[PDB]
Every structure is written in C-alpha cells, then in structure tokens.
Amino acid sequence: LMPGQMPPAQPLSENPPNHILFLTNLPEETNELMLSMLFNQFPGFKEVRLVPGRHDIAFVEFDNEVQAGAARDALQGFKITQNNAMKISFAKK
C-alpha cells in the first residue's frame, strides 16, 4: 500500500524541506495579492508568506505540507513577466 501522507523529499541539494516553497526570480512589483492569485488557481492552496527587504523571493504554502512539493515542479519558472520567471524550490525550516 501507499505510504499515505508521505513527507516531502529534499531539493536538488541537501536541505531540510518543509510545508513551504522558496520562490525566486520574482518581479520587482510582487505582492501577496498577486502571488496568492497565481497559487489560488492551483488544485491546492493554503497561505502565502512574504519577506521584507526583498521582492525577487517569497514563500508559499499549498493545500497541505505534502502538496507544496507537487507545486514545485508545477510552477518551475512562472513567466510572471518578460524579465522574471518564478523559480520554485523547497525552503528550509
């Protein structure tokens, strides 16, 4: 049988994964309202997390701690604008 709600795997490098993804290469005008829409349209969404002093990086949670890893491969390099492509990766707790 399946392992059920199996925990997320590590990214392309050694790192402790968690219920949230690290976004990268975001536009210079990003905000929680826009970031929320581009994740709320997915088959799973819970919350979003921003960091001050930044605009090219952010954090986002999917339906649950498991399914954020699914959105990683699903949103890899979101062409939010002509100069910025949202990279998706596992954040660190």
Curated annotation (Swiss-Prot):
Cystine pairs: none
Domain RRM as annotated: residue spans: 19-93
Family: Belongs to the RRM U1 A/B'' family.
Lineage, highest ranks first: Eukaryota, Metazoa, Chordata, Craniata, Vertebrata
Protein name per its UniProtKB record: U1 small nuclear ribonucleoprotein A
Subunit: U1 snRNP is composed of the 7 core Sm proteins SNRPB, SNRPD1, SNRPD2, SNRPD3, SNRPE, SNRPF and SNRPG that assemble in a heptameric protein ring on the Sm site of the small nuclear RNA to form the core snRNP, and at least three U1 snRNP-specific proteins SNRNP70/U1-70K, SNRPA/U1-A and SNRPC/U1-C. Interacts with SFPQ; component of a snRNP-free complex with SFPQ. Interacts with IVNS1ABP (via BACK domain); the interaction is indirect.
Domain of life assignment: Eukaryota
Main function: Component of the spliceosomal U1 snRNP, which is essential for recognition of the pre-mRNA 5' splice-site and the subsequent assembly of the spliceosome. U1 snRNP is the first snRNP to interact with pre-mRNA. This interaction is required for the subsequent binding of U2 snRNP and the U4/U6/U5 tri-snRNP. SNRPA binds stem loop II of U1 snRNA. In a snRNP-free form (SF-A) may be involved in coupled pre-mRNA splicing and polyadenylation process. May bind preferentially to the 5'-UGCAC-3' motif on RNAs.
